[PDB]
Design a protein around this ligand. Sequence first.
Ligand code: BOG
Lengths: 529, 529, 529
Amino acid sequence: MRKAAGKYGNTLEFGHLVGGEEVLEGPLLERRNPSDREDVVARFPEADKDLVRKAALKAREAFAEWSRTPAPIRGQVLFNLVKILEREKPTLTRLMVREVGKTPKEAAGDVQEAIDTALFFASEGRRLYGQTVPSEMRDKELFTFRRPLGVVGIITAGNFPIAVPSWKLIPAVLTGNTVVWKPSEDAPTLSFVFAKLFEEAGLPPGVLNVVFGGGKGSTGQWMVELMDEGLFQKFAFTGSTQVGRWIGEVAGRNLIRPTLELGGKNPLVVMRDADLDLAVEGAWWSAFATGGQRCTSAGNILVDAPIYEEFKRRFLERVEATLVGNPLLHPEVTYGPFINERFFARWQEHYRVGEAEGARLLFGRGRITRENPYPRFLGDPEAGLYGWPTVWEVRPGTRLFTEEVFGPTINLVKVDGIEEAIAVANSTPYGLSSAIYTNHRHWAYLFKVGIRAGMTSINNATVGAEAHLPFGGVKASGNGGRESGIWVLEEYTYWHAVNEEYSGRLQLAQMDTGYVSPKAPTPWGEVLG
Amino acid sequence: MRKAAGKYGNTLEFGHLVGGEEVLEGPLLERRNPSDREDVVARFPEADKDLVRKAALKAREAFAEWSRTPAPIRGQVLFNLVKILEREKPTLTRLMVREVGKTPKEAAGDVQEAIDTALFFASEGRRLYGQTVPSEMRDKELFTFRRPLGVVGIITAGNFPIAVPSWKLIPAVLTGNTVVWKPSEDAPTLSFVFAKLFEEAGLPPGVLNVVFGGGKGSTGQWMVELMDEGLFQKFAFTGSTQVGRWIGEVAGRNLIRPTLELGGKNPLVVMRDADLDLAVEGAWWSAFATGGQRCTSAGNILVDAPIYEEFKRRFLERVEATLVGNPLLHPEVTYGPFINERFFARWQEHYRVGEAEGARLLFGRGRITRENPYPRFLGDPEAGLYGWPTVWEVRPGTRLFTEEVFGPTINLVKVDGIEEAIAVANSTPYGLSSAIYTNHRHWAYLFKVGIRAGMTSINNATVGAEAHLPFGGVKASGNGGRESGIWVLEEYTYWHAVNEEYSGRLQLAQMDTGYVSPKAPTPWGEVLG
Amino acid sequence: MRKAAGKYGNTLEFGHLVGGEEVLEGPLLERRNPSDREDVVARFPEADKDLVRKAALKAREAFAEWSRTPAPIRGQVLFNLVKILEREKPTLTRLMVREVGKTPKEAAGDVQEAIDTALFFASEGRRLYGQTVPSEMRDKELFTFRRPLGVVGIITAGNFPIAVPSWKLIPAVLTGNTVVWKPSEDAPTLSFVFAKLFEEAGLPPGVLNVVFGGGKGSTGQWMVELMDEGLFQKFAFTGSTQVGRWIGEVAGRNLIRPTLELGGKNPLVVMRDADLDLAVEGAWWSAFATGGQRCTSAGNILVDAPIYEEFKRRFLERVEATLVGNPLLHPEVTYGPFINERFFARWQEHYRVGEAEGARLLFGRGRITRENPYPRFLGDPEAGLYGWPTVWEVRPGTRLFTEEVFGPTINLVKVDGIEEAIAVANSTPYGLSSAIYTNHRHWAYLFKVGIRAGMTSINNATVGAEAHLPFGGVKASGNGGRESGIWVLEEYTYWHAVNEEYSGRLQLAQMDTGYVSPKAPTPWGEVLG
Ligand SMILES: CCCCCCCCO[C@@H]1O[C@H](CO)[C@@H](O)[C@H](O)[C@H]1O
């Protein structure tokens, strides 16, 4: 790599990581600081299909030795990574604030998720339990083993540039797979550095390959297409449902079960008996954490009729207090810029769609500019794409209600009773996260069994999942796979059933099984009388 | 249903089972006894897309009440089925001999697999374990629950008309799902009866719907296409890889992980130190059980060079002793007719492909006729499609070596040493079953870790998997899913992670976590010696 | 603590660790370097019953806050310990060579076991899985949780002064318990330092209390007796079966299940087909690792008749090559001194018992002195208690065959065939470790299912268990408990079953359960053929 002086740090120039070598091949892209476009964070090439193919073949070559490396040793590599991530947490935090516009508080939590993941799977090296199973035949033993799949293709987004990649990278290599990783073009430096920390931790060259570039019409797409050439035995993707469906399609015909985290429209229910201040804080954080650029961000606040006016009043008050700005210059802000222009553009459009379909705009004036200033802004709004906190009143069945919109926007929806709250909460193509604020035992229970969601919070935000629960969605949010904890092992391994015969005879199961039949029954009705 | 007298039993006329009602709608198909075309087993309608859609909506309606039925009660229904299958085993055995041409011995084992499955999952009703998980926050609890998916679409083959459907039907309903089942047109009576046994066991109407018909251009295809209309939350299919890839494709874009069992080309290795008589018997049974119409049937016998001539001699001797015939009239036969004409046709062609590519035909003269008689045939060969036991000598890389061929055919392949045996055993697009005969600890181990297969037998056949191990293949044989035992629960449920807050505060994971930092270290090198 | 200059390092003076405070109360004991009596390693007090009682009450006080500390945070403390043990491994290694007379190679492996344990349970903080279980009633949920027991009393030996204590200390505190630890008077410095490393890692004061002293008539005994006062909710002990039975007795009447590792007489079988050089090396290492002062040390080498003379010849040759000496001055030695005089005394007596009962002494002349020199000795044999490598030929049923003897001694026993090998291998009151050397699949299997032992090695030593398998013995070697891995969690937690009702009615299990009865059966025998 090379470095040059920049505004808020060095501008990094680096290439793809392929077979341990740095490959500077392809038209140069750059990543500008989203808080300040004058600050250039990285310059990096776009990998073409031929280079991704080459990376996949380097991964296949490295897979042989790596899969044969004892899992406890592979786990000790991850343990090295835990120490290295701990050491580098402040540096990675600072780089993440700069590269994707996260607050230092959130950026540290993002790095911490990777540390948590690393520690969890470091120890998993001495687990990866299969089963010993009793044969129905004598002189025979049955076994199950978890085996690695091969080469994993990974495409990740930039909103969680260390945490979410770690959910895939760490289990993948722990279970004995090799990886080709196409990180978001919004967080290439973090991705490059993270790959180098793996190298420092002792991960053999070629086990992790990083190929930079865009998505559609670019490296991301090339990578999906190479599933047709048999170069990936597994695929993982975070992004939109639209793209996920196509990846599911390609994976499906290549007999791959992809890991798909495909976003959501996450209902947060506030029942009449709720702790209003707690529910307001939870709804606020659910909506505006990461500037609403999380898959788990609250989409709709479903508020029970009797507290609707009081909640709206308190919620808008809380929303109005939100600090927005350059988090590098003003750490205390709740959120900073949009991660990229694509998200900003879609978010600008949702104002027009909302007005067109009769949503009531309670708060928000679109992009924050010097001409259109936001009272609690800190820094220069012209330096990047920053969005007004935005609050709507919407009806079910509308586009603002059903469609995911990354960015600082949230809808209030009036409901009456737990039955309607559940029905309305499920009136969305998605089913990722969910939440209900209530002190009512029974309502909490009804919501928990009534919601169709991968994750449910009782008196907690739709965001901030703990790193050691299964993470994933139902309906349009996923395809059944789960990340994190013990539940992700199904994603990166396959079951190998072994039966060992010692009888020296061909014994047929279900046919030669030595089942004992019952004896003649005693007439106990008559004996006991 | 209606019945009329037939040659070897009553001819059954029945319709689709939809919402509890019998629906006799659609152009009539018939199933003739494959051992004797004069014996008509069943007449049944072909369901059009509209009726399958209606069946899927009946399943969705029944799902609400059935998923809310406590799992231990759903398990007690399966326990009722265990008793009913036990009672009906002789009747089902006889019907299976008649309808699909299995031997009574194999037909009983087929019914027994369903009984084993039924008993396993009857008890699973009081298991279905999720987890309690410790929160990193105080006054907070984490939980995981297994939830049913919804409506399961099931398409099954006729080669295992009770066993293999039970692998899907039983776990599906146990886990709280409803089912639309499109059984093979080769085993419609068995399927109808099996569905009625579920009804007798107390399965509520609409939880299992059966729609009869063909595959391509027919009910099977309509059923796959309805995944695009959101009518299936899960899909299971047994059949060819070609069809499986298409089903995987459709499932994939609808964010479904299908259960796909897609056949194999199963290597059986005989090492130089093997028990020859045992390996011969295992190779023979692996090749000719069910007339080689199993997904797990041996495709290639890989024989170690030093025992090659001796094994070939003993194997051909064993093959020559094989009895073939109408298993209804001659129970003692090893195998009877082809299940259908599709399998017979492909099997006839493999002679021409083998000769064309220079395979050496050691034994077999194609279809058994009066003109082309087989010495050990019993009954009338003109009454159905019966195949000569067929043995080839082939080279790796040839079509006979790589391509699956249902029917009584097997290849011998010369290998030298465990390294070559493993490499050649993996030189196939498939990876379902596998086997090695050896007394050498180390060779068994190398094969076990070297093979790419879902299942491996040490000194046992490639066939005859025990019903309580995970069943499934890698590569072209499957997509990662497993059937049977605890491993199939992932197929018919999704994980629901619930976090419950009691702290009355918004606590952020990874950010507010109360991690304890270390104290000042003592310089022990200096303090001690 | 205080330090003074000594021969091979500083002499440490320290007191008991009770509630965070160092308590220098009680008659002073000392630990002399077992390799060199002139080198005084430590001076430390003997805790009386009143101080142990006080330590137990400090543990009870600390238990409240520590058990309420989230398990993931408790795990992060262990993760701190992993880093600290890594840092201190060279220092701990050196101290262990000095204090208990282990070779540097073995001492490092001992420290590494603790690091392995620490890492395993660091990650267990985010596991400790209980279950969610489906109720047979509607509107009801079932849960299981692992809860800590309370205060754990731990008594450990000095032969594995870091490894074996870590097996108890680490899981105990991870699962939320507090500990009173009575370490061996043979390794008080290591124990003091290990406790201080826990303190450095952030373990709250009082969660680990260390009380030094002897066993019988001393601190060890006082500690067992306090189970009668309800001060321990759990107890763990490593030592002799005799003492273990008494501890089991006291624990039993106080409704405690103690963790008891009680030594063994570990059979190593060498079958006629074995790799002789490998079996010789394994038998040699099994016998003389730690100078035969392991619970898992080989007691009897059972050699198959046809290879008996050849094995004896090669084994005695290998034994004769054994280097013995001061491992601080000569790291390359296989073993050094006896850990204590108790073990030396019993080992001296076994010569007299062996001769008395007609055992044939093949090799060994008792204590190594200048008068009685050993050819391959390095250093001064007068400086400590060093034992000749000792090899016997014995018959089954004799005291040398059945009774555990710590120290460098081993018996050869002639057997003929796997049946006799198994019977003779089981002809001992113990059942800890076991091993068989064979290339015969079937013999390995028969031994594996025929042996009565907690642990069995196939073509591996009776020693050197991997730290992530369950460790423990049957018969006189233990009481059912297992240490290490997931299996030790049962030792330090109890199951809490919770049922939550939401139905608003009293529903009786087994009585009000809504079991569905079967429908009227169809006579299928008659309906079909
Ligand atoms: C990693 C995916 C989650 C694993 C689910 C819990 C696994 C627990 O394994 C359990 O073992 C029990 C012991 O008899 C069996 O009875 C249960 O069927 C089985 O679920």
